[PDB]
């Protein structure tokens, strides 16, 4: 009975990404984050902009999804941040056990 | 009623990845891209090769999926590019609203 | 009839990530890997730690999933590695054909 989720967001810089990751570990809402640098593009005020951001995947259980969204929402510098959940199909047994323990 | 998708592809270099991202924003087929550098490996002509590429995730709505595949297909330098769609489970409400508006 | 999967893991460094990718191509258990550098955070022995790792996505068919997990399990330096599978929804036809051929 795997119950893992993967939530993705982006952040304006490395420091903010890692700061939020750490706060989310402190609040036991995720078991792990993986962050990396990205280049981004989107419309902003009628122009296509290029930006430099940090992305993060947050690994946690379904049970924590609500609390995680609401905490990321409160911590997020962006007025409308990208926060979304990918579907996980299977997970190594030992790893799922460790995930669950890490967010209890 | 979330209707977001995530499409992934890889590109031979940073410039091509960003160039295509921008063209896809211009054609309103995606709301956002996030690109990053990757190392890759695969079989090519009977050998295992290591390569250096740029990956991109393209965020858009289901409604745009067909047009997006066909546009990436036409723009893609690779004869057989990796283009595939990940399933998104949930999405922050404000963000889904902005996604939809960005591709209208 | 797409039958592609995406399996994710993390590794202590670039060399190990690429070494395992290559061994997995040699054993024909994946068609392709894409690896990239990440910063990570998790609990370890009662503290929140920051780490520097390499992530990899491994692209393959459903048919190879079992063999892939068991091979990554045997090769993985971590005692409890993150190994999990994302659900793929659609895939470019030509690309799915190449995936299948690459792991036969």
UniProtKB/Swiss-Prot annotation, chains A, B, C:
Please name the Pfam families in this protein's record: CutA1
| GO biological process, alphabetically ordered | response to metal ion
Source organism's superkingdom?
Bacteria
- Alphabetically ordered keywords of this record: Cytoplasm
Gene3D superfamilies cross-referenced by the UniProt entry: 3.30.70.120
Output the Gene Ontology terms for molecular function: copper ion binding
Please give the InterPro entries that the UniProt record associates with this protein: CutA_tolerance, Ion_tolerance_CutA, N-reg_PII-like_a/b, N-reg_PII/ATP_PRibTrfase_C
The yes or no answer to whether the keyword Cytoplasm is present is yes
Cellular component aspect of the GO annotation: cytoplasm
List where the protein spans the membrane: none
Q: Where can this protein be found?
A: Cytoplasm
Q: Does the keyword Cytoplasm apply?
A: yes
Subunit annotation: Homotrimer.
Return the similarity comment: Belongs to the CutA family.
Q: Which PANTHER family match?
A: DIVALENT CATION TOLERANCE CUTA-RELATED, FI09726P
Instruction: Describe the task this protein carries out.
Output: Involved in resistance toward heavy metals.
Name this polypeptide is given: Divalent-cation tolerance protein CutA
Specify the species.
Answer: Thermotoga maritima (strain ATCC 43589 / DSM 3109 / JCM 10099 / NBRC 100826 / MSB8)
**Gene designation:** cutA
């Amino acid at each position: 009975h795997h119950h893992m989720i993967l939530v993705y967001s982006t952040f304006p810089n490395e420091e903010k990404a890692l700061e939020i990751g750490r706060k989310l570990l402190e609040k036991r809402l995720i078991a792990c984050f993986n962050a990396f640098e990205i280049r981004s593009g989107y419309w902003w005020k009628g122009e296509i902009v290029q930006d430099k951001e940090w992305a993060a995947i947050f690994k946690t259980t379904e049970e924590k999804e609500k609390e995680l969204y609401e905490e990321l929402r409160k911590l997020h510098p962006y007025e409308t941040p990208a926060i979304f959940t990918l579907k996980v199909e299977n997970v190594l047994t030992e790893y799922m056990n460790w995930l669950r323990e890490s967010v209890l």
